[PDB]
């Protein structure tokens with residue numbers, strides 16, 4: 286298992302694992318595009334497989350994701366210059382993420398609400414930093430499908446949410462002060 290912060294490649298896929306609560310979450314790297322997680326009374330973590338360089342790809346996944354508390358099943362990544370953390374949220378637990386509402390985008394058989402938020406003095410790919418988060422949050426839950434990431438990126442940019450140079454992009458599980466499991470397979 287992965288149980289400490291790291292990135293790398295496994296079976297052809299980039300992966301990232303991060304937590305502020307070492308010991309509360311584990312990630313197993315499965316075959317091909319597969320991984321799984323298990324957490325118990327965690328702080329915050331984000332883990333997943335995907336790509337070292339994000340962009341306008343189509344991301345096809347399916348997942349076991351039936352959380353009891355606060356957690357997200359979400360496309361997730363970063364840009365630099367500007368430094369931005371971004372989310373395309375497919376499902377969630379007790380809490381549906383929200384923020385400053387910008388409008389909607391209709392893609393991949395759903396409609397998503399566009400939100401913007403900001404994290405202050407927070408962990409990032411660039412260390413402790415302040416940075417915006419951009420969100421698309423599906424209006425109803427789903428745990429399999431295709432995400433046309435470009436359709437989100439363009440819609441955000443059309444709403445003045447500017448992305449910089451892409452860093453990593455993963456189909457992520459995120460947990461927060463919760464317990465649970467996920468098993469996610471990138472097609």
Ligand SMILES: *[C@H]1OC[C@@H](O[C@@H]2OC[C@@H](O)[C@H](O)[C@H]2O)[C@H](O)[C@H]1F
Pocket residue numbers: 301303329330331370404407408409410418
């Ligand atoms: C979004 O998710 C959690 C956290 O992002 C981590 O920042 C540290 C970096 O090394 C990891 O790769 C990221 O997953 C960020 O604070 C939050 F806003």
